[PDB]
Design a protein around this ligand. Structure first.
Ligand SMILES: OC[C@H]1O[C@@H](Oc2cc(/C=C/c3ccc(O)cc3)c3c(c2)O[C@H](c2ccc(O)cc2)[C@H]3c2cc(O)cc(O)c2)[C@H](O)[C@@H](O)[C@@H]1O
Ligand SMILES: OC[C@H]1O[C@@H](Oc2cc(/C=C/c3ccc(O)cc3)c3c(c2)O[C@H](c2ccc(O)cc2)[C@H]3c2cc(O)cc(O)c2)[C@H](O)[C@@H](O)[C@@H]1O
Length: 40
């Protein structure tokens, strides 16, 4: 039988940064990049 205890780890109440608890990432799809030299 394992005894679970929490005493020392991470103790930070006010964060000095914009703390967004969400996965930030825009769905773009198509990106610009025209490269046609000799044989493409
Ligand atoms: O030290 C770098 C800057 O730290 C900032 O505080 C910080 C120091 C550290 C953590 C310090 C840590 C230290 C030793 C160690 O063995 C382990 C972790 C972390 C901070 C801020 O926010 C992170 C945070 C807090 C709450 C969450 O729910 C999630 C993340 C935390 C964090 C944790 C982590 O697992 C990995 C990280 O890269 C960051 C200060 O405000 C700045 O002044 C300082 O320049
Ligand atoms: O998939 C990640 C691994 O593969 C490779 O990257 C990649 C980075 C990114 C895209 C990066 C992106 C970045 C910024 C941004 O604003 C927008 C899009 C994407 C990859 C691979 O394949 C996706 C792909 C390619 C052709 C298709 O016909 C369909 C999908 C593409 C993709 C597009 C998308 O609209 C949404 C996605 O989640 C992924 C790299 O080797 C590494 O990043 C990594 O190993």
């Amino acid at each position: 039988d394992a005894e679970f205890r929490h005493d020392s780890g991470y103790e930070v109440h006010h964060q000095k940064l914009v703390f967004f608890a969400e996965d930030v990432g825009s769905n773009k799809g198509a990106i610009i990049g025209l490269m046609v030299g000799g044989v493409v």
